[PDB]
Design an enzyme around this catalytic site. Structure first.
Site, mmCIF file in Angstrom:
data_model
loop_
_atom_site.group_PDB
_atom_site.id
_atom_site.type_symbol
_atom_site.label_atom_id
_atom_site.label_comp_id
_atom_site.label_asym_id
_atom_site.label_seq_id
_atom_site.Cartn_x
_atom_site.Cartn_y
_atom_site.Cartn_z
ATOM 1 N N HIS A 105 31.623 12.241 36.612
ATOM 2 C CA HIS A 105 32.883 12.213 37.325
ATOM 3 C C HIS A 105 32.623 11.986 38.793
ATOM 4 O O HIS A 105 31.884 12.747 39.431
ATOM 5 C CB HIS A 105 33.644 13.509 37.076
ATOM 6 C CG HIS A 105 34.207 13.610 35.690
ATOM 7 N ND1 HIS A 105 34.215 14.784 34.968
ATOM 8 C CD2 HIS A 105 34.752 12.673 34.880
ATOM 9 C CE1 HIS A 105 34.768 14.573 33.787
ATOM 10 N NE2 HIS A 105 35.106 13.301 33.713
ATOM 11 N N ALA A 106 33.253 10.941 39.316
ATOM 12 C CA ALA A 106 32.865 10.338 40.589
ATOM 13 C C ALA A 106 32.971 11.308 41.750
ATOM 14 O O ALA A 106 32.089 11.363 42.600
ATOM 15 C CB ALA A 106 33.700 9.101 40.852
ATOM 16 N N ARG A 107 34.054 12.072 41.779
ATOM 17 C CA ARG A 107 34.293 13.017 42.871
ATOM 18 C C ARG A 107 33.457 14.298 42.871
ATOM 19 O O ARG A 107 33.514 15.061 43.858
ATOM 20 C CB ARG A 107 35.769 13.401 42.925
ATOM 21 C CG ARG A 107 36.274 14.171 41.709
ATOM 22 C CD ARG A 107 37.768 14.012 41.597
ATOM 23 N NE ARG A 107 38.353 14.676 40.440
ATOM 24 C CZ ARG A 107 39.653 14.632 40.132
ATOM 25 N NH1 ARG A 107 40.508 13.938 40.883
ATOM 26 N NH2 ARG A 107 40.109 15.280 39.065
ATOM 27 N N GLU A 108 32.703 14.556 41.803
ATOM 28 C CA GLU A 108 31.969 15.819 41.657
ATOM 29 C C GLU A 108 30.590 15.682 42.287
ATOM 30 O O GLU A 108 29.561 15.763 41.615
ATOM 31 C CB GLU A 108 31.908 16.210 40.172
ATOM 32 C CG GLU A 108 33.278 16.612 39.645
ATOM 33 C CD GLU A 108 33.392 16.609 38.139
ATOM 34 O OE1 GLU A 108 34.522 16.460 37.608
ATOM 35 O OE2 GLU A 108 32.371 16.785 37.456
ATOM 36 N N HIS A 134 28.482 18.963 35.871
ATOM 37 C CA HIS A 134 29.816 18.697 36.374
ATOM 38 C C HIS A 134 30.132 19.726 37.461
ATOM 39 O O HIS A 134 29.344 20.630 37.725
ATOM 40 C CB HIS A 134 30.838 18.835 35.251
ATOM 41 C CG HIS A 134 30.827 17.701 34.264
ATOM 42 N ND1 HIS A 134 31.781 16.710 34.271
ATOM 43 C CD2 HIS A 134 29.990 17.401 33.247
ATOM 44 C CE1 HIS A 134 31.538 15.849 33.303
ATOM 45 N NE2 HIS A 134 30.452 16.243 32.668
ATOM 46 N N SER A 135 31.288 19.565 38.093
ATOM 47 C CA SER A 135 31.911 20.630 38.874
ATOM 48 C C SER A 135 33.431 20.497 38.746
ATOM 49 O O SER A 135 33.908 19.472 38.250
ATOM 50 C CB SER A 135 31.455 20.562 40.339
ATOM 51 O OG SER A 135 32.149 19.565 41.070
ATOM 52 N N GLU A 167 29.459 23.596 34.871
ATOM 53 C CA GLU A 167 30.432 23.395 35.945
ATOM 54 C C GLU A 167 29.910 24.187 37.140
ATOM 55 O O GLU A 167 29.845 25.422 37.098
ATOM 56 C CB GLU A 167 31.835 23.907 35.566
ATOM 57 C CG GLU A 167 32.465 23.289 34.328
ATOM 58 C CD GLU A 167 33.118 21.948 34.547
ATOM 59 O OE1 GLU A 167 33.017 21.369 35.658
ATOM 60 O OE2 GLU A 167 33.741 21.469 33.571
HETATM 61 N N1 LIG Z 1 34.272 18.597 35.303
HETATM 62 S S1 LIG Z 1 35.749 18.614 34.775
HETATM 63 O O1 LIG Z 1 36.601 19.265 35.734
HETATM 64 O O2 LIG Z 1 36.235 17.294 34.461
HETATM 65 N N2 LIG Z 1 35.709 19.503 33.441
HETATM 66 C C1 LIG Z 1 35.266 18.931 32.178
HETATM 67 C C2 LIG Z 1 35.337 19.999 31.085
HETATM 68 C C3 LIG Z 1 34.797 19.538 29.742
HETATM 69 C C4 LIG Z 1 33.531 19.950 29.334
HETATM 70 C C5 LIG Z 1 33.023 19.561 28.090
HETATM 71 C C6 LIG Z 1 33.778 18.751 27.242
HETATM 72 C C7 LIG Z 1 35.051 18.341 27.635
HETATM 73 C C8 LIG Z 1 35.561 18.737 28.876
HETATM 74 C C9 LIG Z 1 36.110 17.764 31.742
HETATM 75 O O3 LIG Z 1 35.543 16.720 31.341
HETATM 76 O O4 LIG Z 1 37.360 17.876 31.753
HETATM 77 ZN ZN LIG Z 2 33.474 16.678 35.592
#
Ligand SMILES: NS(=O)(=O)N[C@@H](Cc1ccccc1)C(=O)O
Ligand SMILES: [Zn+2]
Ligand SMILES: [Zn+2]
Length: 304
Positions: free
Chosen positions: A64-67, A192-193, A266
């Site tokens: 995810h680009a913003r993380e 992720h975050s 996260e």
């Molecule tokens: N980093 S995040 O805010 O996008 N959270 C994740 C949470 C997540 C983690 C594992 C499987 C599906 C979803 C996301 O993909 O929504």
């Molecule tokens: Zn994410």
């Protein structure tokens, strides 16, 4: 100029992948596992001392680009591997006995866009039929209850599942690599975050993996180990009930391929800064996260 204590643009991370490999040839090799929508090379580092029939742990960042803290963490992990090899008994044993596949940035096109145009971009930068809305959520694009709960069918939405599972060049490349190396890959870690969690399957439905007790105990212990450094509080558990249900996630897909240790991290924080975590927190975030990653790694190594 690259620094581990700042957020680095893609040109800088790319250059870093080349330099860190050339500086550490006995511990790191580099390959490209494919190209993005826009034609950028998706680099992967293999971190470890060569040896016969080594099992592997796969870690990716930057879905995810913003993380931005995610991207920073993959870099920090490599930093630690090269710096502490020989000096820290555990990291040395890990690198001697296992290989770490470290994918520093999956969604390179989105990451570039967060630097150039929109800091809060999430998705890829591919096009969609019948609309000018751009991008697919890479963590809704895997073949894992694909495009059901917590994933949107609308290409203009932030959780858009794509036109088909693995429709994105980036997710197809990652899934192809894992499938091709399945016999060696024993754990899958995806960074992720934010919100301070260690998640394991399942997110695509309210169901539990066969080794739920094991994963629960491992996650619990990893969270406790992380907290030892600065007291940072993480929650843990199966994704659907620990954060929210969401289909098409890579951790669930990886688990369903038979990778029994599959976790989504996260990282910091709990919403004060959210995705725009200040550079002043990179060090502390990465150092505490290292303790959880090393705990999980040590468990995997001892339970082969
Ligand atoms: N980093 S995040 O805010 O996008 N959270 C994740 C949470 C997540 C983690 C594992 C499987 C599906 C979803 C996301 O993909 O929504
Ligand atoms: Zn994410
Ligand atoms: Zn350190």
């Amino acid at each position: 100029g690259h620094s581990y204590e700042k957020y680095n643009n893609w040109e800088t991370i790319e250059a870093w992948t080349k330099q860190v490999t050339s500086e550490n040839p006995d511990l790191i090799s580099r390959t490209a596992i494919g190209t993005t929508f826009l034609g950028n090379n998706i680099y992967l580092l293999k971190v470890g001392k060569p040896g016969p029939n080594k099992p592997a742990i796969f870690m990716d960042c930057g879905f995810h680009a913003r993380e931005w803290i995610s991207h920073a963490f993959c870099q920090w992990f490599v930093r630690e591997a090269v710096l502490t090899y020989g000096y820290e008994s555990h990291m040395t044993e890990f690198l001697n006995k296992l290989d770490f596949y470290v994918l520093p940035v999956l969604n390179i096109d989105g990451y570039i866009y967060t630097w150039t145009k929109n800091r809060m971009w999430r998705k890829t930068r591919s096009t969609n039929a019948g609309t000018t809305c751009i991008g697919t959520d890479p963590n809704r694009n895997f073949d894992a209850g694909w495009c059901t709960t917590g994933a949107s069918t609308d290409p203009c939405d932030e959780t858009y599942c794509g036109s088909a599972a693995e429709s994105e060049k980036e997710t197809k490349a990652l899934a192809d690599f894992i499938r091709n190396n399945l016999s060696s890959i024993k754990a899958y870690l995806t960074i992720h975050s934010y919100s301070q969690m260690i998640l394991y399957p399942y997110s695509y439905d309210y169901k539990l993996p066969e080794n739920n007790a094991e994963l629960n105990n491992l996650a619990k212990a990893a969270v406790k180990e992380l907290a030892t450094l600065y007291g940072t509080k993480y929650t843990y558990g199966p994704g659907a009930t620990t954060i929210y249900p969401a289909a098409g996630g890579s951790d669930d897909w990886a688990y369903d391929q038979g990778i029994k240790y599959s976790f989504t991290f996260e990282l910091r924080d709990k919403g004060r800064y959210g995705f725009i975590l200040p550079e002043s927190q990179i060090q502390a975030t990465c150092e505490e996260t290292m303790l959880a990653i090393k705990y999980v790694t040590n468990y995997v190594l001892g339970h082969l």
